[PDB]
């Protein structure tokens, strides 16, 4: 008789699902799966950018990590901005060189319009790729957990030289264009939260099941719970 | 786990 | 009072990364072998769950596990899905999974191939008893030319599931072995002509569908191995 | 072969 079959049969792994919705358009699923790894991509150069940056590998480990989980999508969606305004065609967005979405050709309205701020907000300051340099580190710097960072002492010190490195990047009343660059900055929280919301939103949804590379689904799922708590803490350079 | 392999690196 | 570090930063500035965009690639196409890719990397997860539940599988070196899940995932996949086909009563329907299901043009061959496992389950009214021995087997199908590190387990375990198909079929039955040994034979046709599309579409850059990270160390693993002929088909019938 | 040989040892 038998006995190995019976126990094969125990083995036998369970029928798992696609995660296949006939109903979403394949247009949308391709495109957003399709930025999906692309940012899982620019996350992972992010990671080796970020410890290239004077001072930062000084912090402590944790707050390392802290830092790019909660800013990623700033850096990302200000990166995003800079490329479409240096395509110097107004209302694209270059996400690469081969996909500019041309806004042109209404689910993703609030977002689109949140992502063509920042490369509307360039454009109309003129930002120099000095200013862009330094704004965009500082966006890596622009959100904290509320309860604070193990190198508090340090990050502070580190915030301070790339605040004062942007000022020198400006640098004969010039600190007009100083509160300028750090308003874009502030109005980057409210641009992040529209794009992180968005984004939890199809990395939770099943019926669609958009696909995320490991790097970014473990940042949204060490990041969904912070979001839900209010733990972050964003610093701004202007009172709202 | 990924984010930390990668600032171990 | 001169910016020292935004020269620091320019130097690490990141290189723009192109994200494997092709407009010409039919976005229905590129969704179904994309979501084909992920379901298939979370199978072949729970496929090496289910290697290690095998009684003597844990045995071997540990070299020799990984060997035999390389070497044999497109047979184990392919065979399950003819299976899920099967047991829809449909011998000319794909069920990848119970909300993937392929009602019936460069894929035409591919999805002969993929379609013949099914209804050879059909034609030989193959039972659950018979298909699970005959799964394990798989797994134990392709060895490296060179031979495996556990030679002696691997003949003793493999051994083991062909006198348990024979068990199955025990109550015509010599007869019904040719038939099963047969089709077992016939997979290696079959895994080649879906490994061929695998490797293919794994490299083509303009389509870049897209792989889990499981399935694409399978695949990065195999293609030298595939390349040279570096794979001993073992065989039931000459 | 990381991600195979973590599963096994698993
Ligand atoms: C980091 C990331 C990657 C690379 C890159 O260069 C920059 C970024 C920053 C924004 C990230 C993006 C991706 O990861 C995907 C994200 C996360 C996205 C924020 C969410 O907005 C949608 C999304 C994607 C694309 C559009 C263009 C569009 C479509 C239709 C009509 C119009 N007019 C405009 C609109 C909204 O895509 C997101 C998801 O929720 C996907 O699930
Ligand atoms: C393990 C895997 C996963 C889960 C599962 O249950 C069984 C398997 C075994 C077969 C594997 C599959 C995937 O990995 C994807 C594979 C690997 C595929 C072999 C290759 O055939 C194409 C392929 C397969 C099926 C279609 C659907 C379709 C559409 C229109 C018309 C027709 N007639 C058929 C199209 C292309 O998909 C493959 C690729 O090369 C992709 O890049």
Not at chain 1, 65 to 84: C, D, E, K, P, V
Not at chain 1, 106 to 117: E, G, R, S, T
Request: glycine share 4%; with cysteine.
């Amino acid at each position: 008789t038998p006995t190995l079959v019976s126990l094969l049969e125990v083995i036998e792994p369970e029928v798992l699902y696609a995660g296949y919705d006939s109903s979403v358009p394949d247009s949308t699923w391709r495109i957003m799966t399709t930025l999906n790894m692309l940012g899982g991509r620019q996350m992972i150069a992010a990671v080796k950018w970020a410890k290239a940056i004077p001072g930062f590998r000084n912090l402590h480990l944790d707050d390392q990590m802290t830092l790019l989980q909660y800013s990623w999508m700033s850096l990302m969606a200000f990166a995003l901005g800079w490329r479409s305004y240096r395509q110097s065609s107004a209302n694209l967005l270059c996400f690469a060189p081969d996909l500019i979405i041309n806004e042109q050709r209404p689910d993703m309205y609030d977002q689109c319009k949140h992502m063509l701020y920042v490369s509307s907000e360039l454009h109309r300051l003129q930002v120099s790729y000095e200013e862009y340099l330094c704004m965009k580190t500082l966006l890596l710097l622009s959100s904290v957990p509320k309860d604070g960072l193990k190198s508090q002492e340090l990050f502070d010190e580190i915030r301070m030289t790339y605040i004062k490195e942007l000022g020198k990047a400006i640098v004969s009343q010039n600190w007009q264009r100083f509160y300028q660059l750090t308003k874009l900055l502030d109005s980057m929280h409210e641009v992040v939260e529209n794009l992180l919301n968005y984004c939890f939103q199809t990395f939770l949804d099943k019926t669609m099941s958009i696909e995320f590379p490991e790097m970014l689904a473990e940042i949204i799922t060490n990041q969904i719970p912070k979001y839900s708590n209010g733990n972050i803490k964003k610093l701004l350079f202007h009172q709202k | 786990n990924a984010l930390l392999r990668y600032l171990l690196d």
